Amino acid sequence: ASVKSSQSSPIIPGFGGDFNLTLLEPVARSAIEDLLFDKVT
Amino acid sequence: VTVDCKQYVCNGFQKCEQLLREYGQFCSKINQALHGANLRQDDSVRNLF
Amino acid sequence: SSLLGSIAGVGWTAGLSSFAAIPFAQSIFYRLNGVGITQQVLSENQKLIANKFNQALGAMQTGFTTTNEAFQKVQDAVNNNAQALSKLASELSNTFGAISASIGDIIQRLDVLEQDAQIDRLINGRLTTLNAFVAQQLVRSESAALSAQLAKDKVNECVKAQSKRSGFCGQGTHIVSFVVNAPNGLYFMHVGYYPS
Amino acid sequence: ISASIGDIIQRLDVLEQDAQIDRLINGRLTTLNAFVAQQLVRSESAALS
Amino acid sequence: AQLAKDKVNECVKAQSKRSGFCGQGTHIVSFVVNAPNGLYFMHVGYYPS
Amino acid sequence: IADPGYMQGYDDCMQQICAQYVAGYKVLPPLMDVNMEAAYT
Amino acid sequence: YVDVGPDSVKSACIEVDIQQTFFDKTWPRPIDVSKADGIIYPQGRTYSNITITYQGLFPYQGDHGDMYVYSAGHATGTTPQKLFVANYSQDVKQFANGFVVRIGAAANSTGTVIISPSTSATIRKIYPAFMLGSSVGNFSDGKMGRFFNHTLVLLPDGCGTLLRAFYCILEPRSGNHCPAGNSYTSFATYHTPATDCSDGNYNRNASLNSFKEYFNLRNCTFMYTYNITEDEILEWFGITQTAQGVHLFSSRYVDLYGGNMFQFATLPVYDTIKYYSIIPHSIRSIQSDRKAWAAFYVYKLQPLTFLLDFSVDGYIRRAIDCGFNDLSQLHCSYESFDVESGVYSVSSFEAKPSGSVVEQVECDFSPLLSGTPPQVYNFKRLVFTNCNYNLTKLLSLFSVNDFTCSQISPAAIASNCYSSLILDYFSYPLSMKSDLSVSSAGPISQFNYKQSFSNPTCLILATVPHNLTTITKPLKYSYINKCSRLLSDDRTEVPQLVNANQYSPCVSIVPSTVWEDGDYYRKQLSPLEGGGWLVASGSTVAMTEQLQMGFGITVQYGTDTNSVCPKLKIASQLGNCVEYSLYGVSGRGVFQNCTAVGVRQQRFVYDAYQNLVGYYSDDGNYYCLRACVSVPVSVIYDKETKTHATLFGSVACEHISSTMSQYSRSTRSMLKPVGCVLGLVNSSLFVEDCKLPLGQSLCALPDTPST
Amino acid sequence: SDDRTEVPQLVNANQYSPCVSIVPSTVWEDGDYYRKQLSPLEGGGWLVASGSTVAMTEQLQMGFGITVQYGTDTNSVCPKLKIASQLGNCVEYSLYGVSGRGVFQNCTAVGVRQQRFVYDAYQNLVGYYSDDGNYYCLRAC
């Protein structure tokens, strides 16, 4: 509740041109988050 | 400071060393725990400077 | 993910939070204009920076294991609470007490009179060590709430705003920072400057 | 009975000797484990500070 | 308590141009009253809506 | 401080704290020589 | 008893040539537990792919063990002659915890024929034979190696196709060259391959028959046979003993190709095995049939904690001897064939006691032997300060019926030195032993005699013989069975309990001997004494043939202390290191002529704790003591290149020696010099600046990269 | 070997006394004593013993000492009296010297297979053996 409050862009596959952001959700637990959930045992 | 258990308890006497061998798990967890404590502290020194 | 949405517009600022929708590229040219105080002629001529930013995030993709703590801190956390839970609960049961086959003299050995004596050893001991586990959960719970209030201090400073301050926002004049949920915690991908 | 070895020779028979010594090891190692918990406490607070 | 001193010197004297700590919104005023064992804050924040 | 011993204080106490005599407990050195912490600051 | 077949009908034994120098070879095959050499699988349960630290009987890493070799005998071109053996029969070993045996390791390689060193041949596996038992000595002609009473014999046979295990009395036979005959050198076993190992017709009794020529087997409780499939594969054999009996282990049946040992027999041998020898075998080949036989190796077992690595299929293919050194310790003290790369502290290295200083003549037990021992409630007290005692002397006069101590043992109470001995003696009947106890609430502890609970105590029941005549008997044994006060209200009764080191308050009214069982005594009290009455009642036990006595000893154990040691240059100055043993206290110290703080008329000086820092006693100077010397060692493991490097804590480049022999624990069995910035390290080299910096980042500032 | 020091030879569990070599199978008379000089290899000095007697009774009186080991393995040893066998594919079992409550399944394939349990680094058994002859790996309740 002290995280969100306001106001998204929203999540579109192009965030920044051209900053390749891995932090996109592919679709729900984005790709870098997938790396640090798969590699953690 | 790290304690060198299995010779803190006991003073170095063989019967008492065998009675430690019964507790050979606990001593390992002691010195394991302190060595972990020193690596966390040492990374606080290193990361600090 | 809505936090990643608010990275660009909220990282502007001009107040937290009553804003905005600005593209992420221009958010890093203003975040980069701010504290890496290179003004507009350098970011105009040139960009690519973009390929250096993406190169930075690329090595941020490849490197997790093993020599890259933070990540060993993450598995120090999962191995911490998994170790405490399962391994301390494996020390708590099987075995502790003086005669400790789960049930002393379970259904198979003597004595019915002394059975309460050895069992009461096992209950005083096993419940006492359980109470040590409860004291431990209060300790790591309170320290987890301290560190969570730190994370709220790292989201409201380093993630929304820039934050014109040193590490906390680790090692260099800070530019962007990203939040992803790690096991039990958050996880930051602070994008800092490095002069060299 | 805690003259640094519980009835090592002297002060009690060897078979019991293990009884008084095992008192001294359970106690002395348990209090050592309290020292290790204390080092974890002041180590964590030292890393906070 | 050192946090409270950090909340009095930041949020109570000055404004403090920072998020929560100075809870939930662009902070405006904050007031201090003595509670049982502690202080107590009445942070007056903005709420856009 | 009654401590420390680094190849002069062990022998110096042997000429006579007991991190090196009970053993027992034992104090490890602090990762950095004093001239070098002095170099940082 | 079991029929083991007929005695030998031979009237002589085969002559035996002992030539130890032909068997003195260096063919090292040390234990390598990395390859799981010498590993008995755990008995209690069995496991899958799991690794673990486990304490059990193991040989130690790098142990070369004892090597044994069997040889072809003397021969002409046509005729086997004298046997040819080593001196193994006279070399009796202590069994201790048992042993494991590496068998056949050199099989298939080329080696010497032993009796003809210039002749080489393909090496074939041969099986060892053992003699084990509880009692040994010499044969009639004085040679060692004779086993007495029932003896366990493990004897392979049938050209290596069976093992025989049997437990018999071994009666030495008296023909020429036999162990109770003339011209005896050594016993041995043999077989004759030309006639015993022909295809399809192996002689399954050849070795047994040869053994029966040297010994008649008598009163055999069992004779078991175990069949062995013929091959040249390396194997391991083990033997231990547990109350059930003697347990035999082999790799053959469960892990033929890998070497792990599993139990295949428990022999009903319940007399503890203390000794064993290797039975020499000689092969009665003719010259053209001579082969080389694989040496075998015996390694003693001891309780050790190993890291055990279990494969998926359950077998152990890699172990670590944790106590081998600090690196292995780290390796282990973690339950992990791999210990992450860093500094790991392993314990001392404490110095050895040398120059055991003893400080203190002859304790006077006189008045005990002369007269009539009083009754328990009038016990006489002998005090002992500053003297030497022969107590086993005193207890050799009497016949002793019971000896129990509290917070000490009877063994210990003879040995140790004490400041303040006290001997209490009195007449006391053996019939009342259950009432003379430190854990007793009978009349004796209540009203007669109570020892201190704060000092270590002993209680002795004895009987004066006849041989002792200066000790006179009284009319009967007497004791107090009631001692109470009647308050001035005439009907509150308050028992008057005896306090330690004191007499009963009723000894003023109870005669030195009670006239008749059940007599009672009374005495009105003065208003100052409290008013009311004092009341007592005496009991009697009939006098015995030989007088029976009670002895109570109390040692300090203080407090005020010193000068009372037993009796029996080096035990004085200048023992300027560990150890001392003062009459007052034990301890291990380094005395120095220090100055000048103390009391100086009683002898010690403490520093706010139990310790003594430490002068007195010498005559008269200041030998101030210190705590023990310990070298606070560590390990610099570096698992990437697997290179350990033992670091000492803070001392010394000058004081250590390589594989230091003045100190106790490496730790523990085996160890394995550059400083001096931090301390001393057993690792080259000197700086070597400057890089990078990173882990594994040792102390003050050696940053120590590898390799 | 000093002719002064007497050291009692205490019997260890599930062994005989070191004095059974010199004490007759029945003591001839109460208080008889036995001696045997020791070889320098045996330690020197002497071995010494003394026997006691109690008068025989009308009916012979005996002593029995029993010692049990819970398996673990072999050879097995239960009292006597499709059921108490497979397929009890849930709780409960009661094996040789070991109790427990488990859900057996035909699993594969890790063990010793010669002695008949398998543990996993603790007191527990995970868990096959004993059935004849298959892999009924057990689980907790």
Numbering used by the authors:
A (entry chain B): 851 to 877, 886 to 899
B (entry chain C): 802 to 850
C (entry chain B): 949 to 1144
D (entry chain C): 1047 to 1095
E (entry chain A): 1096 to 1144
F (entry chain C): 900 to 915, 924 to 948
G (entry chain B): 18 to 377, 381 to 588, 595 to 698, 710 to 744
H (entry chain A): 508 to 588, 595 to 654
What wording appears in the published article?
The key determinant of host specificity is the envelope-located trimeric spike (S) glycoprotein, which can be further cleaved by host proteases into an N-terminal S1 subunit and a membrane-bound C-terminal S2 region.
The cleaved form of the MERS-CoV S ectodomain was confirmed by SDS–polyacrylamide gel electrophoresis (SDS–PAGE), and further N-terminal sequencing revealed that the S ectodomain protein was cleaved after residue R748, three residues ahead of the S2 cleavage site. Strikingly, for both trimers we observed two different classes of particles during three-dimensional classification, representing two conformations of the trimeric S protein with RBDs in different states (standing or lying). For MERS-CoV S trimer, two classes were found with one or two of the three S1 RBDs in the S trimer in the ‘standing' state. The reconstructed maps of these two conformations were refined to 4.1 and 4.2 Å resolutions without symmetry imposed, respectively. The atomic model was used to interpret the 4.1 and 4.2 Å maps after being fitted into the map by domains. We hypothesis that on the cell surface one CD26 may crosslink two S trimers by binding to standing RBDs, one from each trimer, whereas the monomeric ACE2 receptor will bind to the SARS-CoV S trimer in the pattern of one receptor to one S trimer.
